[PDB]
């Protein structure tokens, strides 16, 4: 059920994303290219704070997560929690971000 | 609250795990070197399918996710979540495990 995926860092496109996201949230499993996608599919009231918390905490290479209600390509929400590992280089700047998405609708009811 | 880890396949080795095991856990942080110390740490009736089903589905390249009981250092038990996500190498051989444990001592109240 867990949905695995990865973004690469530097381009901020994803590197995979498990195609359990499309009988999840209907969106064909190839339309997720990058953060923007991410980023779009969410609830307005949440697209308010999620995506600049994600972002420092990225940035910070702070592992992190978050619980939203993310938009089914039918229109409806359903409650996500998105669970990230951020990853970091040789160099120690920060490479990657590793985690997996969960439907959490079962926590809303 | 999530915490991160990975295994290196070949020597089944903890490459890291987050500190936060230690709150949840009491072991030390450092005590975790590989998958033996993870099938130990465990309650004997999960030890009985735990193991053998994670085995079978990381060499089989699958992902997957398991609910047991993980054993405190004080020798009470913890309700866990693993998943797990199977890395492979250019070959597309198993290279590694990378995932999440998650205390899910709520969702057994």
């Not at 339309?31 to 704070?49: G, L, N």
């Not at 992190?64 to 390509?73: S, T, V």
């Not at 409650?79 to 969960?102: K, P």
Request: aromatic share 12%.
């Amino acid at each position: 059920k867990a949905i695995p995926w990865k973004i690469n860092w530097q381009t901020m496109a994803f590197e995979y994303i498990g195609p359990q996201i499309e009988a999840l949230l209907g969106w064909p499993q190839g339309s997720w290219k990058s953060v923007e996608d991410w980023a779009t599919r969410m609830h307005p009231e949440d697209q308010e704070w999620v995506v600049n918390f994600c972002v420092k905490q990225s940035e910070c290479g702070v592992d992190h997560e978050a619980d939203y209600r993310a938009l089914h390509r039918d229109g409806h929400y359903v409650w996500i929690r998105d669970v990230v590992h951020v990853v970091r280089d040789d160099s120690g700047e920060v490479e990657a971000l590793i985690g997996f998405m969960f439907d959490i609708s079962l926590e809303h009811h």
